[PDB]
Design a binder for this molecule. Structure first.
Ligand SMILES: CC(=O)N[C@@H]1[C@@H](O)[C@@H](O)[C@@H](CO)O[C@@H]1O
Ligand SMILES: [Ca+2]
Ligand SMILES: [Ca+2]
Length: 398
């Protein structure tokens, strides 16, 4: 699902975020209502010519796999710009843009940009609409969001282009989507751990959900709405004590079928350290007691190792089963801190359980009270030899 991008009002700094909507089957439906049709894009020009056959028209041909590239890169004296002319004066609030997507994908990405408007067909009467930047990645298809503005001509300036050779796979234009912008303001800030005032009760939130039901990408809003709901209904952090002990029931296939969360419920895994050699994080969840992750950063006086696993579906767990590397036992979580989040994204973790067990071969369970998990954090509060290793990390239900 979609994650709220934060509210934008403009001073005139554009909100730039990854355009994840492209990976959805709802795109055609969304484009139907909000996209400025390509048939409305009359013509295009630019001030820097073109490299080889990467002609400027290829920037607005509706094909992400064809690109324009400038013939003259940015330097101290020259800034690449593109000017799109529309059939009629068109109200636009968003540009969806990608750099070239060939073998040199990302090269020429508009790391910094300015957007200008003209209501006339000719002459330099352009006024500045919005300035923006995107530092995350050069390879991304990004949504650039600014104040809804009338354009006969839209000028896009490559204030900073990655490696100077400005490129564009596509420039796409969208009309204002008020409900989408309402969704984007669901949380107070980028940490998304506090619901905004206009949705800060279940009554308000549920009514908002109902308001969105006819929206073409309503299905993609559900995750964010559920996230807000989880926050609104969250109970105070009251960590219990986890009883740890050696177990062997992981061998029991039938038992696993009933009580172990399916491995395919794991959306992603990450950790706060790196990893020593080729003992990467993914082999902590490969269902192989012989392969193990090892940390690339040991437990300092000010540092604990912690591993984070995201789930597709929220699940209620009472046990987390783990083991160290079986050769040495170096990195056995002698003392464990377990954190639960009921949201898919955001700074919404809370401590649920604490426990300790001596370093031992095999697998160890950490049994606590039934807790809901959308994501889990496994912290090495105390570890053997100050390292951190996991051969397997498993999640068991009550
Ligand atoms: C494939 C590839 O990277 N091609 C690029 C080309 O598009 C242009 O940017 C050129 C500038 O000298 O550098 C490379 O050859
Ligand atoms: Ca193209
Ligand atoms: Ca493993």
């Amino acid at each position: 699902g979609l994650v709220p991008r934060g509210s934008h009002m403009a001073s005139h700094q554009a909100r730039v975020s990854k355009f994840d909507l492209y990976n959805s089957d709802k795109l055609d439906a969304y484009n139907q209502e909000f996209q400025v049709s390509r048939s409305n894009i009359k013509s295009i020009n630019n001030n820097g010519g073109k490299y080889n056959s990467s002609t400027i028209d290829k920037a607005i041909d509706g094909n992400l796999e064809t690109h324009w590239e400038t013939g003259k890169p940015n330097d101290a004296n020259f800034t690449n710009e593109v000017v799109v002319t529309f059939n009629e004066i068109t109200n636009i609030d968003r540009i969806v843009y990608s750099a070239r997507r060939d073998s040199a994908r990302g090269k020429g990405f508009a790391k910094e940009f300015e957007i200008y408007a003209s209501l006339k067909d000719e002459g330099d009467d352009f006024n500045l609409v919005s300035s923006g930047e995107y530092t995350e990645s050069t390879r991304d298809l990004v949504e650039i969001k600014f104040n809804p503005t009338d354009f006969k001509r839209l000028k896009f300036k490559f204030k900073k282009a990655d490696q100077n050779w400005a490129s564009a796979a596509e420039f796409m234009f969208y009309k204002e989507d008020k409900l989408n912008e309402k969704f984007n303001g669901l949380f107070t800030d980028s940490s998304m751990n506090k619901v905004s005032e206009e949705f800060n009760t279940l009554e308000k939130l549920n009514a908002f959900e109902n308001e969105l039901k006819d929206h073409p990408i309503y299905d993609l809003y559900k995750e964010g709405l559920n996230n807000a709901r989880a926050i609104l209904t969250e109970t105070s952090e009251n960590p219990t004590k986890a009883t740890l002990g050696q177990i062997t029931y992981n061998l029991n296939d039938d038992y696993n079928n009933q009580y172990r969360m399916p491995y395919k419920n794991i959306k992603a895994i990450k950790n706060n350290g790196r990893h020593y050699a080729a003992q990467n994080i993914e082999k902590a969840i490969d269902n192989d007691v012989n392969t193990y992750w090892e940390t690339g950063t040991l437990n300092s006086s000010s540092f604990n190792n912690e591993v984070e696993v995201e789930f597709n579906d929220l699940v209620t767990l009472d046990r987390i089963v783990y083991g160290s590397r079986q050769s040495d036992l170096k990195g056995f979580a002698e003392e464990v801190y377990i954190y639960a989040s009921r949201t898919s994204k955001g700074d919404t973790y809370k401590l649920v359980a604490t426990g300790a067990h001596e370093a031992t071969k095999g697998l160890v369970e950490a049994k606590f009270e039934p807790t809901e998990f959308k994501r889990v954090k496994f912290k090495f509060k105390k570890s053997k030899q100050n390292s951190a290793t996991l051969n397997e990390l498993m999640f068991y239900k009550p």
